[PDB]
Every structure is written in structure tokens, then in C-alpha cells.
Design a protein around this ligand. Structure first.
Ligand code: TPP
Ligand code: TPP
Ligand code: MG
Ligand code: MG
Lengths: 806, 806
């Protein structure tokens, strides 16, 4: 559960003290000095003479155009957290301002705790300076290695979705979400503005969006900064916000005059937020206007105004590095030396090199710190889900009526299971879906919870299962759902989210980024505890898009997921639910797991059930298993072909083809691969099937016919070094489809039962079976003409039931 | 060039006639009847008795929740185009309202022209009804097979970007962009609202956004419909629009009263647009507020109000199909019969079954029609680029100083070439980039054009190369850039767009969709003429992300591009520019091509040049070629290894390793693969290298060491059936990186020169070369410790120049 920390939502009821703002100004100066020492210096952190070009880095990498503004905001937020005792997580949208975050971690004392070799003295300062963006050092962005970070910020557009996710079901947590003005042009964040219509001020926390409007992107100005102030305020008010505006640094006003002004504006905003929270305890049915801060400052605000006669401060020329070579001229080194001395570090550091005590007296202590806040490290919060007994949801008719029974929909079983998980776990488990929960048949959870909706209600003929609080969030944006769930998991909670297969590509970037958060975490960051897994139910898949057609058919999610399987990280799982029982086993395993991205590919269509629960779990631990009840060959020597399958429709076609093969006396084996990554190379993947086990499943000399859900490229690229891999003949999706009957969909991809039987016959003896092969091939065309003439699939195809049903 | 059609931007200066609105109402009724006959009927289109359940489709697929609103808007737009003679292309954002578009194509006469077997009589109406969403029929969405369509609309969020792209450099074209209210929640379209700050009213056309606010998504209401009207107008005004609002169908007002009211509102909006256009001829430096229409209607507006006691009209229950089974009960069939008779088709069709003449008298004729407009079929507009002589831009120093000369940046050559293409082709070629044109070194085009920017200007110390008109558009959104370019090509123009490699994933969906527009076009749609290719310069690639690090390294674009290579469509090209000359040849070939997606992967870093222009073109036509100047073995028999490469950094490492191999007497071959898809299976890909050519390039028995830009999975999945494929040892990206020196980046991926030399030595004789292998392995660690100690890469690595430089 999310803990209550400090004294939440308290008003100051006093002026901001002068001593605190003294401390805030000194903090800002020292944070800018650290952020510059990191970029430029490799030695001599405190500029003991001789300070020469020997002390400067050979290759200057990093960013400065956002760092002083971030340091300003972070120092003021630190004063605020010390004063109010607020439970606060900062989300840094422009993550390229990494030196700001590392300077915070260093100054609040958490960096030395996490990394003991970076001491708080001259040698520790030298190591801290050298390690930024260095061989064998720390990254340039706001990284998982950086304490106090739940968001990398490298790939832009997801500060707001992550903020609204982090506050969900989390009522005491305050999140200032700093948003770059260039990042605000990206598609994800524009729609992430509208997510205050999906949170409740009573049951969820408060997100304060700080638009960091410094006017410029890389080498280009931002649209928001160059439209009129009337337009900007009108725009933010049309999205349910009260815009506040702060402008600074565009004239010669004294720094204290700026710190004081920001203190009054900040306390005004805090009082509006506290009023909203206090009102929500009585009335939470009508939405408030949350304050949001527009923070207009010059880009690179403390750097030299002009360098080489080019406007540097207040321009895009300060984005990455002013003084691109302070190492190769004497004039640029003098500019750099003057820039470092303009902060007066001589008074901010003591003799031994530690930041002076009066510079950090205004700082929060203990669990209130940014790097120490448990919501930033959501693995220490996390507790296991309390799971219902799986046998309660098993489809038992397979156990007595025989394999292949029924016309059930696989995802309804997961719906019931997830409903009871929600029942056992309220306020820790949440279901997201881009308008598609009821189309993936996960609506059984409406028996115990509602869709959280905080826009207007109009009627009850149209607004069923909607409520101002709920455990089902549903907005038509995959970016929103994925950012919500990722921030939900990163804070310590659990969740599933469902989607159409073809639109998972919309978040290929986001998944990639999350994998990079996991790949980095499992490799080099032990102090970050495991978080829950990102569970993605992929349904309404390529083979059954009757209503939509070719635009909704693209199973390429498997390929993008296969690219993140390296160095024994195991941060990826791709599971194929052949039926409801296998889906139960997969979902149980996935809900128990940690630090992974689990894509469970299950169909919503009426499909037969093949396994019992014990059989499903037994197939699960191996990933691939032989179906002894479907095989006609007792041992590996007898079979004239191995028929392997991965996916519900490929499984159905393999089984129907096996029925026809039985009538011709063909001895074959039947294999089902539930988990794709078990087929990976044994030396590469230590949790994949060993080579002996793989050869036992697939006969070394005998041909293997493989029917696969996605593109066959993904199977062939995975088994390349496996034994008997030359004989594998993968049949997968082949970018051929439309709106048409279900048999046609598999016909045009050469994955129907007739084509599979003909493929197996050709693997054995093309000459002996020539007449039967011809008969099958002309039957495919007759059965297509049947669907054209009559509008539905052939009775031979529709009515087929497996021979193993009693 | 974009043609001027009709009489653009003319005011009516008269009331809308009563006869025209009579026609508009009759059109709306007949369009609704056709849109229902398509979904529900397979026979008896005009309901001659006996009209029985025999006449209804077995499987009812399709959508209705948006179709009557679309028919309303389209009929009114048709009256408008007939009256004003406007050059108009409609972009249908909710593309699942396909029956509306097909009903338009049928009613304006273009459908019979394109498809002669769908006549305009009873049999033709029966075929038109049966073919919708049928085996062997037409798709459900607004498809390339549908005349008058440039946008599929299946995957949501790109109606607005496509509209603003279609009007760019196109001053007489009017685009009403119909936007679904659910689609408006998606991330892409939220930022596509802000694209009126990137178009000029003088040089570009006018986009009118029609928000089709029917209140509901699939099974969920929309955020925009449930916020206050004040908020909605404030929101649209903060984005530079004047909101107009129309509300209809929510009471018992007469249909004519609605058509009249809409006529008046539409002419008011048109007069504001015409005022904007006339003002722009004198003043185009200050941005106007373009009108946008908010079209509030009930979802499924003419369907039965209640079915099964559930609110159907004005609800989300009417999204796909009311009466999910009008075939399986008699009551539902009676509901359907009453629904069809409520339009009074008895007076809309004549005896022979044609739509009556007075129903379509108000319709536009000739080139003004939606299905006949040349901007919808942008292949008939298209003309070839006038290309500068390639030899003008060749890097000639390779020809005299020897291969491997220099430290040039490859993309600057493309910058100059593209600059001269822009010079020869203004107002037909355009450069897009998500804030990254100057970071990919394409800024040479600023010598002949400017960045188009129509927000505010503040200074000239920061606003260089910006102008209210230009051929370089640059917004920080990959969705925006890709939609702009796709609508630019679909209208008949040409373009390039550049991006970081890691963020191309942001548009994996969009590329997929465009490939589906091309796969469908090259297979079954001959009447659609070829459009220019989508040219994507992928730069700032994985191997040289010094400033950014792990968050900016993901070369997975190659994998998603490989999934669209089927059935000899050739709609995909993946090219690796090994140096500037190869880049010139690739870019020339790509600019000449049609109906393709060409990803050109080129580095912006200082890299050596290896080929002359003639050599580069000679490598180009084959895709892969042997470097005879780098090989030490004269024939295929002598070589003890083949070193193949694809990519500038892999090429550099192969060449440096070849230098070390030369010192040990190893006989080897050197191969460079410029085009990835030539390595594909010969039987699958008729334009790939034949099997004999492939075996000639790669020795059958000899091991092949392959250094590859992207993940090795993509190489292994492509050569699976090729000869000698067992001996291939692909070395690619392995998700291991950070901010560090360039040698470290290739060190941690086992793709550096030392590791490649050791790999080749192990392929030959591990025992004989054991000491040398050990020496190489410990040198890698020494050269990494050098970078850690000193901050830059080893002199042995940095200073290395190929031995072939004179
Ligand atoms: C989607 C995406 N496209 C491009 C980039 C490359 N990039 C890194 S930083 C940056 C500019 C930062 O813009 P803004 O939000 O205005 O930041 P600030 O002014 O704080 O530097 C860009 C385009 C990215 N990180 N993500
Ligand atoms: C990105 C994306 N996510 C999901 C879908 C699935 N989908 C198809 S139609 C639809 C609802 C249409 O919403 P809206 O724009 O409100 O349309 P309308 O009210 O006109 O039906 C959805 C979610 C999609 N096409 N694209
Ligand atoms: Mg900015
Ligand atoms: Mg809608």
C-alpha cells in the first residue's frame, strides 16, 4: 500500500522566512557550480591555482540549456518540502538536464549513501565531476542510477502521464511535473494535459504541472513561447487548469528579488492546492481547476550572455554546451573561468571542500528527501498480490469431455480471475485500456469496481459502471495508458493493461524505454528493488479482425519485443495462450513476476480448450511441450513429421490438420510452444531450453512444420543455431488480409488446415501423395468459393470438432 | 505542381437556395439507406416483397455510430462544392465510417467509373450492398480502393497532420478535416491541433477542422463531450481557432430546419475563411484565427432510439452494429425493416433502381467531385524531380589520395545535394524534421530556403533562417513530421525527412499504416497512380550518441521495416550509406523512386570515405559487392575468411581489422552490403540477389564474419535459406551502451576491430593463433583503461588511417 509520509496538505500560515531564501539562493549557486563542474571539469574541482586547461575535460558532453532553471525549481521545492513536510516526488520531463538531478542527489546527502566512494570533500567532488558522461561513469540524463528518479526523460512526452500515474490511488503524494516547452509539442504530452479528467482529488494525489517555458528547443524556438500570453492562459484554462505565471531573469532584477517573488507565488499555489484537497474530503463529485505554473526563464540562465559574438544565454545556442572547446583556445578557457567564478564558489565550500553547513540548513531530512522518498524507489513499497486459488477458474469440461471441447472465449477467464484479484487487492491493482476493456472481454471486473471518470455525467442509460473513483482507467490513448501503468508500477503498485495487437506499435518507443529502465536496473543498480511487471494483454489479434480489416492487422509486437533479449536480463516475456487454462497459468506466473514486460497474446474469439490446468502449468515451466494425446508416434523415431504451434489459431489449424493426417496413417508428433523465448539459443539464454531438451522435443532428422502467430522472420531469427533448424518450416503472418470470413484470413496466409496438411505431405513424399495434395489444393479454392457464394465459412471448416471430444 | 481548380475562395453573396437544401435532405436520406444496405443486406436492395430474413447478411460487420453524421457533413460539403466551385479534399478522421465514403463515391458517379461492374441500377445496387466487408469484397474502412480517399483512418490520430500536409504549398485547396471526438483524445491529434502555427494563409491552403463530437467512443464517452462548453471554446481559442458550434438531432426539430441552420452556419464560416484568404494576399505576416466547427450530434443519429430496452441512438451501443442479429430473430428483423423504411426509399429510387435525378441535381460535376479530385489521387499530379548532376557533389579526394581518406561527415553531402534539389524544385520539395535538421547537418538547404514559422518573431539574434514561408518545416513531434510528409506525397509532391534513429520507433505505427497503403496499392488498385517515396534519413545513430547515451540508442527500426517485405511488393528499402559517395548514389536512387518507404541510415560523424561515385553506383545496383582493393585473396578459394559489413561504423571496424589481418598473412575477402533486402531469399524476393550471385559473393565453405548496424536477429532471420548461412557469424548491436568514448561503444557490443580480428582468427585456427588472440583480448582491456584514465580513445584507435591512403 502507498504510505502516508509527513504531514500532507498543510498550509504554511506564515511568511516565508528570509533565512530560508538565503539558503535557497546559496543552494542555487552551488547547484549551478556543480552542474558546470560535471560538464567541464575533470580535475581541480575548487579551482585551486593553478587552474589550467589541464583541468578541463577533453570531450565536453552534456546539456546546460535547462539545468539552471531545473536547479532553481528544485531548490525552491526543497525549501517547500522542508517547510511543509510534504510527500513529494519530482518528475523531470526534460531528462537531459541530468546534472541538475545529480547535483540534487549530491547536495541532499543521498548520493553519498548510495555511492560511498563519492565522498563529500575535495576528492569526492573531483570524482563526482569526472564521472559525469564519462567512460566508466554515470549517464548524461536523469537515470535509474540517479536517486530520486522514476522517469528517465530521454525520450520526450511522458512526464505528465507518469505524474498522473504516480498519484493514482496515492492520496498523500505531491508531484511537481516539470515539462519542457519543446516537449510540450510532442503528441503524447499534448493529450497528457487532459488527464486531470481521470483522477479524483480525494482518492488520488495532486499533480502540479510546471511548464518550463524557456522558449527554445534544440536550434529552434517552441510554439508555446511564441504565441500570445492570452492564448496560452486561455489554452491552459480550457484544459481544466488555473494558469499561474512566473517570469524571471529577463532583466537585471536582483536574485533575492526573484527568490522572494517565487516564494510568494509558490505559497499562493500551495494554498489553492490545499483548498482543493480540503474541499475534496467533503465534495469529490465536481472537478476543480488545478493550478499549473508557467515558468518563463531564459535558456541557460546563468551562463555568459555572449560568446563569439553570438547570443548564448536566452537562446538555443546554450542547449548542449556553450564553450564547445574550452580546451582548445585560451579565450574560451578565460570565459569558462569567469563563468565558474561568477557563482563565488569560494564562499560555498569549506577548506576541505564540503558544501558549507549554512548552504544546506534549509534542506529536508530523512524520508522526506527526493532521493530518499520511497515512492521514487517503488520496489521497497511493493508487496505481493494476494492471489485467488487458480483451480477455482479452471475450465473443467476438458477434464471429462475431452480435449478440444467447447467454443469459449479465452479472455473471459482472465476477466474473472482479474476481478477476484481486484476484490482481494483494492487500491493496489488497476486495469488500463485504450477504450478496449469491454472489447477484450475483461468486463467481469465491473462486478467489483467501476471505471474512474471525472468529467461530466449526463445520464444512466449511457453511464453504467462509471464512478469518480475506480480501478479501471480507460482513455483512447495508448501513450496515456502505458505511462499511467508504468508510473503505477514504478511507485509500488500492480496492474494489467489490454490492447488490440495492431496498436501496441503505438507504444514501441515507450516499451523500449521501459526495457531500458529494466535492463539498466537488473545489470548495475542493486539498490533499486524489483518493481512489479508491466503486464500487457494483447488481444483482438490479427487472425480475427472481422469488423476492421487490414488496417487493424499487424502482429509486429513480437519483433520489437525480441530485440530486448540480451545478456541474461530476462526483462521480456512473450507468452501465447493456446486456450483459457494456459492463459490462467500464464497470468498467474506473470502476476507473480517482477522487473519484466510480459506480453500475453490471447484471443477474444470463441476457441476450443485443449489443456487442463495441471497440463498447462506443466507446459509452462518448460515453455514448449509435446502433446502426447495428439501424437500418433510413440517415440521420436516413428514420426514422419513434427507439427509445432504457438498461438490459438495456429494451434487450431495444427490440430485440424493432424486429424486429416491421422486418416492417411501419417505418424507425427505434436508440439506446443507457450513461451517464445524458450526457443532461444541455449548459450545466449540460460533460462531457455537446453540443446538436449530441444532435440528431444524436435526430432533431429525429421522435418518440423511450425505454425506461428506473428511473422515467420521472428521464429527463424531465434532458432538459427538450434539443432534441426534447417528442417523447420515456419508458417506465419504474411501481410495478407482484409475484412472477410475467418477461414479466408488463414487461407490467404498459407496457414489454414488444408495448406498445413499439404505442407506436411510434401515434407514426406510429394510423389506418393500427389493426388491427395492436389485434392487438398482444389478443396481450398472450393471452400473459398463457398464463402463467396454463401457469406460464411464451409461446414467442413465451421463444424469441425476434434476427434478427442467425448 | 499543384493545379488551380475551379474558382478558389469565392463568396456566395446570396442565400442558400431552398431547392439545394431539398436536394441535400434527399441526399442524406439516400446516403443513410445505402450505408445501411451495405452493412445489413446481401440481396433485394430495394426491399421488393417478399423482403425476408433471406435478404440479410449472415455476419453483420461494420460501423454505424459515425456514418449518418458523416453523410450529413458530406452532403452539405457537396452542396457547397457545387455552389462555390471549390477545390476540396475531405479527410475522414473516423475512417471506420467507411459506408459513408463508399456511399459518396457511389452517389457522385465516380464509383461506377472506377468499378464498371457496380452499375447504377438494381443489380449494381445489390452488388454494392453485398461487397461491403465481404469475402472477395471491399474493406470496412475508408480504403485506398475507395475513390476520394487519401487517408485510411483505421489507426487514429492523423487526420489533422494529413490535412495540414495536404494544404502545404497548395494554395487553392480547401480541406475539411473531420475529427472524431474519441480520436481527439489520442496523443498525435492533440499536438496536430497546434499546426496552424506552421502554415501560411497566403502560400498554403486552408484546413477547416470539423470536430465530430457525437459524445462516445467504443463503449465509453469522450472527454471533450463531457467538459463544459465554456471549457471547450476556451480550449479551441487558446490554440488559434475561432470555435463555431452546431447542435442537432437532440430534439424533435424538423430535418429541413436542421439543413437550413447548417447552411447558414456553413456560409458564415466560409465567409470568415474567404476574408482570411483575401487578407493574406496583402498581409501574411500576422496569423489569423481560423474557424473550426464543433459538430455536436447523437451517435447513430437516424437509427432506432431503443433496442432491447437499451438506449441505442445517442449512445455507444450504436458504434458498430445495432441489431447484431437481424438474422436470428423475427423481432430484430422487424426493427431493421422499420429502420430501412424510415428513409422512404420508395421515392429516392426509380423503377430500374437508380437514384432519382432530382436527388443528385445539386451535386458537383467533373473534376470538382470528391472522387475525381486530382489531389485525392496524387499520382496523376506527380512529376519527376529535376535533379542536379550527381558528379558535382562527389567526394573526389578518394579518387586520387586513395580509399579510406578523410574525416568528412556523410550527411553534409546530402545536405548540399538536397539544397540544389530545392533550388531546382521550389514549391514541390520540402524538408521535415522533428527539431533535428541542423543536428543531422542538413542545414546547407538554408542557403536557398527558410524554416516556415508562423508563430511570433522576437529577435534576429535567435530567429535566423525563419520565415513565414519556407521549404523546411520543423516541429518537435515525429507524428507531425511523418503525417505532414505522407500527406505531402499523397498529394503529388516530394520530400525528405530526417530523424534520430532511436525515435523513429515513435512512428512505427504510422510507417506500418503507410506500408499498408502501399501494399494495398501495388497489389489490387491499378487506377491509383504511383506517388513519390517516403524518404527517411535516419541519422545520429546508435554508435555515436556521445551526448545522450543509452536512452537514445535503439536501432530497432530495421526490424519493423523488415516485417513489410512480402509478395514482391518492394514497398520497403533499407540502405546503409557506408560513406558520402554511397549516400549520394542511394539518395539519387531514392529520389527517383515511387511507391516506397526508403530508410537511408547514414552517420553524421566524421568518417572516412571508401568509394568513388562509379564504384558506389556499381555496388548499388547489386546491393552487395566485393571490395577487390581490400581483399588479399584473388579468388574465392584462397580466402580463409569473408569479412562482410553493412554500415559506416561496421565498415570502419571491418577495414581496421583487415589491416591487422594483413600483417598476419591471413587471406580474406571483403564484402559490403549497401541494401539489406538484397540478402533476402531469392524465391521470396525476385529483386534480391540470386543464389549463384550470393554464393559467388560469399564462399560456400569459408566462414563469413558479418558486422551489422542493427540487432543481429534481423540479419539471421533474413539469410536462413541462403547457402553458407550456417557459417555466417553476425555481430550487431547488443543493447549495451552509455555515454562514453566512441571506442567504448563498439567495445561493449563485441564489434570493435580487436574483437573482430579475434573472431576471424578463431574462425580459422583457435590453437595456432592462441597467443595472438590472447594479446588482442588483453589489448582491448588496456585500451579501455586508457580511455578511463585519460578521457579519450587510444592513439592506436583514434589515429588509425587505412594503409590505402596516399
Ligand atoms: C521524442 C523525442 N524527439 C526528439 C528528442 C531529442 N531531444 C532531446 S532534448 C531535445 C530538446 C528539448 O526540448 P525542451 O523540452 O524545450 O527542452 P529544454 O528547453 O529544457 O532544453 C530534443 C528534441 C527526444 N528526446 N525525444
Ligand atoms: C490508436 C487507436 N486506438 C484504438 C483504435 C480502435 N478504434 C477504432 S474506432 C474507435 C472509436 C472511434 O472513436 P471516435 O473518434 O469517437 O469515433 P466515433 O464517435 O465517430 O465512432 C476505436 C477506439 C484505433 N482505431 N486507433
Ligand atoms: Mg525549452
Ligand atoms: Mg465519438
Amino acid at each position: 500500500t502507498s504510505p502516508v509520509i509527513g504531514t500532507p496538505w498543510k498550509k504554511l500560515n506564515a511568511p516565508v522566512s528570509e533565512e530560508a531564501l538565503e539558503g535557497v539562493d546559496k543552494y542555487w549557486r552551488v547547484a549551478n557550480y556543480l552542474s558546470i563542474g560535471q560538464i567541464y571539469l575533470r580535475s581541480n574541482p575548487l579551482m585551486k591555482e593553478p587552474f589550467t586547461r589541464e583541468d578541463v575535460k577533453h570531450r565536453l558532453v552534456g546539456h546546460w540549456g535547462t539545468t539552471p532553471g531545473l536547479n532553481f525549481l528544485i531548490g525552491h521545492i526543497n525549501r517547500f518540502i522542508a517547510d511543509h513536510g510534504q510527500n513529494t516526488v519530482i518528475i523531470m520531463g526534460p531528462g537531459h538536464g541530468g546534472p541538475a538531478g545529480t547535483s540534487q542527489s549530491y547536495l541532499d546527502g543521498t548520493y553519498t549513501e548510495t555511492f560511498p566512494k563519492i565522498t563529500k570533500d575535495e576528492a569526492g567532488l573531483q570524482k563526482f565531476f569526472r564521472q559525469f558522461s564519462y567512460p566508466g561513469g554515470i549517464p548524461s540524463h536523469f537515470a535509474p542510477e540517479t536517486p530520486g528518479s522514476i522517469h528517465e526523460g530521454g525520450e520526450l512526452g511522458y512526464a505528465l502521464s507518469h505524474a498522473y500515474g504516480a498519484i493514482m490511488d496515492n492520496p498523500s503524494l505531491f508531484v511537481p511535473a516539470i515539462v519542457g516547452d519543446g516537449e510540450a509539442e510532442t503528441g503524447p504530452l499534448a493529450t497528457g494535459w487532459q488527464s486531470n479528467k481521470l483522477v479524483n482529488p480525494r482518492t488520488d494525489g495532486i499533480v502540479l504541472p510546471i511548464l518550463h517555458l524557456n522558449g527554445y528547443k534544440i536550434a529552434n524556438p517552441t510554439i508555446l513561447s511564441r504565441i500570445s500570453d492570452e492564448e496560452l492562459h486561455e489554452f491552459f484554462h480550457g484544459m481544466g487548469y488555473e494558469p499561474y505565471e512566473f517570469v524571471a531573469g529577463f532583466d537585471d532584477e536582483d536574485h533575492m528579488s526573484i527568490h522572494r517573488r517565487f516564494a510568494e507565488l509558490w505559497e499562493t499555489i500551495w494554498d489553492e492546492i490545499c483548498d482543493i484537497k480540503a474541499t475534496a474530503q467533503t465534495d469529490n463529485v465536481h472537478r476543480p481547476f488545478y493550478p499549473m505554473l508557467i515558468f518563463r526563464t531564459p535558456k541557460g540562465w546563468t551562463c555568459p550572455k555572449y560568446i563569439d559574438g553570438k547570443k548564448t544565454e536566452g537562446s538555443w545556442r546554450s542547449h548542449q554546451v556553450p564553450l564547445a572547446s574550452a580546451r582548445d583556445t585560451e579565450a574560451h578557457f578565460e570565459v569558462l573561468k569567469n563563468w565558474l567564478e561568477s557563482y563565488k564558489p569560494e564562499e560555498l565550500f569549506d577548506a576541505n571542500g564540503a558544501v558549507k553547513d549554512d548552504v544546506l540548513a534549509f534542506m529536508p531530512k530523512g524520508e522526506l528527501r527526493i532521493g530518499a522518498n520511497p515512492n521514487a524507489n517503488g520496489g521497497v513499497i511493493r508487496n505481493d498480490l494476494k492471489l485467488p486459488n487458480l483451480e477455482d477458474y479452471e475450465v473443467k469440461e476438458v477434464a471429462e469431455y475431452g480435449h478440444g471441447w467447447g467454443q469459449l472465449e479465452a479472455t473471459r477467464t482472465l476477466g474473472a480471475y482479474t476481478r477476484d484479484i481486484i476484490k482481494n487487492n483494492p487500491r493496489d491493482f488497476r486495469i488500463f485500456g485504450p477504450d478496449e476493456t469491454a472489447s477484450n472481454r475483461l468486463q467481469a471486473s465491473y462486478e467489483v469496481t467501476n471505471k474512474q471518470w471525472d468529467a461530466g455525467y449526463i445520464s444512466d442509460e449511457v453511464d453504467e459502471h462509471m464512478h469518480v473513483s475506480g480501478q479501471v482507467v480507460e482513455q483512447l490513448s495508448e501513450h496515456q495508458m502505458e505511462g499511467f501503468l508504468e508510473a503505477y508500477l514504478l511507485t509500488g503498485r500492480h496492474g494489467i493493461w489490454s490492447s488490440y495487437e495492431s496498436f501496441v506499435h503505438v507504444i514501441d518507443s515507450m516499451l523500449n524505454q521501459h526495457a531500458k529502465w529494466l535492463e539498466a536496473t537488473v545489470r548495475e543498480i542493486p539498490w533499486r528493488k524489483p518493481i512489479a511487471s508491466m503486464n500487457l494483454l494483447v488481444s483482438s489479434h490479427v487472425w480475427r479482425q472481422d469488423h476492421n480489416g487490414f488496417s487493424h492487422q499487424d502482429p509486429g509486437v513480437t519483433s520489437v519485443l525480441l530485440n530486448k533479449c540480451f545478456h541474461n536480463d530476462h526483462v521480456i516475456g512473450i507468452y501465447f495462450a493456446t486456450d483459457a487454462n494456459m492463459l490462467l497459468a500464464i497470468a498467474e506466473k506473470c502476476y507473480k513476476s517482477t522487473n519484466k514486460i510480459n506480453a500475453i497474446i490471447a484471443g477474444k474469439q470463441p476457441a476450443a480448450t485443449w489443456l487442463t490446468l495441471d497440463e498447462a502449468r506443466a507446459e509452462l515451466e518448460k515453455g514448449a511441450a509435446a502433446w502426447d494425446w495428439a501424437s500418433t508416434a510413440k517415440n521420436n523415431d516413428e514420426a514422419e513429421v513434427v507439427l509445432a504451434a504457438a498461438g490459438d489459431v495456429p494451434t487450431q489449424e495444427i490440430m485440424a490438420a493432424s486429424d486429416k493426417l491421422k486418416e492417411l496413417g501419417v505418424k507425427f508428433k505434436v508440439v506446443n510452444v507457450a513461451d517464445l523465448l524458450s526457443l532461444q539459443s541455449a548459450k545466449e539464454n540460460d533460462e531457455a531450453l537446453t540443446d538436449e531438451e530441444f532435440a528431444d522435443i524436435f526430432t533431429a532428422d525429421k522435418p518440423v512444420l511450425f505454425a506461428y502467430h506473428s511473422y515467420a522472420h521472428d521464429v527463424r531469427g531465434l532458432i538459427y543455431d538450434r539443432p534441426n533448424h534447417d528442417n523447420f518450416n515456419v508458417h506465419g503472418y504474411e501481410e495478407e488480409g482484409s475484412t472477410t470470413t475467418p477461414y479466408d484470413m488463414v487461407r490467404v496466409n498459407r496457414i489454414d488446415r488444408y495448406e498445413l496438411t499439404a505442407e506436411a505431405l510434401r515434407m514426406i513424399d510429394a510423389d506418393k501423395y500427389a493426388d491427395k495434395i492436389d485434392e487438398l489444393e482444389k478443396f481450398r479454392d472450393e471452400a473459398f468459393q463457398f464463402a463467396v457464394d454463401n457469406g460464411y465459412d464451409h461446414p467442413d471448416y465451421t463444424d469441425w470438432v476434434y476427434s478427442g471430444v467425448n
